[PDB]
Amino acid sequence: SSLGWESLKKLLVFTASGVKPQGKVAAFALDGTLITTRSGKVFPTSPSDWRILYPEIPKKLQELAAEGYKLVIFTNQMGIGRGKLPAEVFKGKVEAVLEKLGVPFQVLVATHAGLNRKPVSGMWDHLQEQANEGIPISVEDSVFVGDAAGRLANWAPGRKKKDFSCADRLFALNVGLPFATPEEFFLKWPAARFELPAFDPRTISSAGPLYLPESSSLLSPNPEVVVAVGFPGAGKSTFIQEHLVSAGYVHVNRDTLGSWQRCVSSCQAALRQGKRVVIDNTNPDVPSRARYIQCAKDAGVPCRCFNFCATIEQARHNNRFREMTDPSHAPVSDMVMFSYRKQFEPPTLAEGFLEILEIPFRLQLDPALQRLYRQFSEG
């Protein structure tokens, strides 16, 4: 009898009869890799809407098992976490697929966004640390096979669409696994052309200066207004807390003050009191920023802009990292991200700023969290 299903926080694991721990793994995505629709539709019409993708598949799997590879599936199924796909039904579909494939598999299912969702390596770490009886797995001798491979359109007849995702290729990259597409692997087709995301989080450094120009000072001894600018999730608020509010700057958040009449009133009152003020908002465009410049000008104090360099990709990456690691994080919607980008006009001295400091996007974190930060986290 099979050890069967285990249900964890944001993970399902199935261990078939005959699964043995091994020092090397041949791992597979499920949908689009081992199976596709029987119906010939892009998306399955029922739980039973599947067939084995290529008849070459079972033979390769038998060869792999005979060579000592532990056969494993790593499948994203966020429809389960979203409530659109019942777990108990998906479990049944998997068991039927495994029956048809005719070999013992261990299956890991990422039901939610976060640490377990490919390309993040959570499922690999669960396999290694919890589900392989303490046997170290040689990543160099293993392989991951999947269809979310970032391929350009037309790698084969009837593939006018590029891959929906690069999550499978990126999962392999994060873990250090050799990677192949189903057609490369099962069919021995030549390598398909693919693209990787433009932002590579492995390139993120703690290095470099905190701000530029370095000859400048983050603080002023006299009243002033600092206007922060940068994507939400860029880490503006954390920076502003650490360096300005800790130094006694009055924190101004337009969102929470109600009107402008009140935001500018707050600013003006702080300035009369001999205080320095920081505007901690996205402030993407000239009109957003002009209200604070005018406030400063009226009070006769300098206005400076702190321009956070994070790109949209870096911001979204940071947002996903914080969602996975920080229980106080307010998740930023893609709606607000792309909205900001639409509105963004870079700050210039012409608007009326005394100076503009650039704040490079830099790695802030426990060593483990640093390893996690350098993982691609979206396909």
| Stretch of 116-124, 142-150, 228-236, 354-362 contacting Mg ion, by CB under 5 A | 142-150
Q: What span, in angstroms and rounded, lies between the C-alpha atoms of 32 and 34? A: 6
Work out how close the CB of 201 gets to Mg ion at its nearest, in angstroms, rounded to a whole number: 22
In angstroms, give the least distance from the CB of 324 to Mg ion: 22
Check residue 29 for interaction with Mg ion (CB under 5 A).
yes
Q: Are 374 and 317 in contact (CB under 8 A)?
A: no
Unique residue bearing structure tokens 């450094």: 205
Stretches 27-35, 54-62, 152-160, 172-180: which one binds Mg ion (CB under 5 A)? 27-35
Of 39, 159, 54, 167, the residue nearest 100 (C-alpha) = 54
Least distance to Mg ion, CB of residue 26, Å: 16
Where does this chain touch Mg ion (CB under 5 A) — which range of 115-123, 140-148, 154-162, 311-319?
A: 140-148
Is there a binding annotation on residue 231? Answer: yes
Task: Give the shortest CB-35-to-Mg ion separation in angstroms.
Answer: 9
User: Would you say 113 is a known binding-site residue?
Assistant: no
- Joined together, the tokens standing for residue 178 give 């050799």
Q: Which is nearer to Mg ion, 71 or 372 (CB)?
A: 71
Kindly write out the interface string for residues 144-183 of this chain, putting x where it contacts Mg ion by CB under 5 A and - elsewhere. Answer: ---xx-----------------------------------
Q: Mutual orientation of helices 167-175 and 122-130 as an angle, nearest 10°? A: 50
C-beta contacts of 353-356 below 8 A and 24+ residues apart: 353/227, 353/293, 353/303, 353/304, 353/305, 354/302, 354/303, 354/304, 355/216, 355/304, 355/305, 356/304, 356/305, 356/306, 356/307
Nearer to Mg ion, 173 or 226 (CB): 173
- Phi–psi pair at 51, nearest 5 degrees: -150, 160
For residues 281 and 244, give the distance between their C-alpha atoms in angstroms, rounded to a whole number.
Answer: 14
Q: By beta-carbon distance, which residue lies closest to Mg ion? A: 32
Does 123 sit near Mg ion (CB under 5 A)? no
Binding residue per annotation — 68? no
Q: What span, in angstroms and rounded, lies between the C-alpha atoms of 78 and 324?
A: 15
Residue 328 marked in a binding site: no
Is 330 annotated as contributing to ligand binding? no
Q: Measured from the CB of residue 49, what is the shortest distance to Mg ion in angstroms?
A: 15
Q: Identify which of residues 147 and 224 has a Cβ nearer to Mg ion in the complex.
A: 147
Q: Is 235 annotated as a binding residue?
A: yes
Number of residues that bind Mg ion (CB under 5 A): 5
Burial class (CB in 10 A: 0-12, 13-18, 19+), 263: buried
Q: Residue 203, CB half-sphere, CA atoms under 13 Å: how many? A: 6
Q: Annotation-wise, does 339 bind a ligand?
A: no
The response to whether 236 counts as a known ligand-binding position is: yes
Shortest Cβ 193–Mg ion spacing (Å): 18
Identify the DSSP state of 247.
Answer: G
CB of 146 to Mg ion, least distance (A): 6
Amino acid letter at 131? Answer: A
Q: Does 32 bind Mg ion (CB under 5 A)?
A: yes
Q: Point out which residues bind Mg ion (CB under 5 A).
A: 29, 31-32, 147-148
Annotated binding site for ATP: 230-237
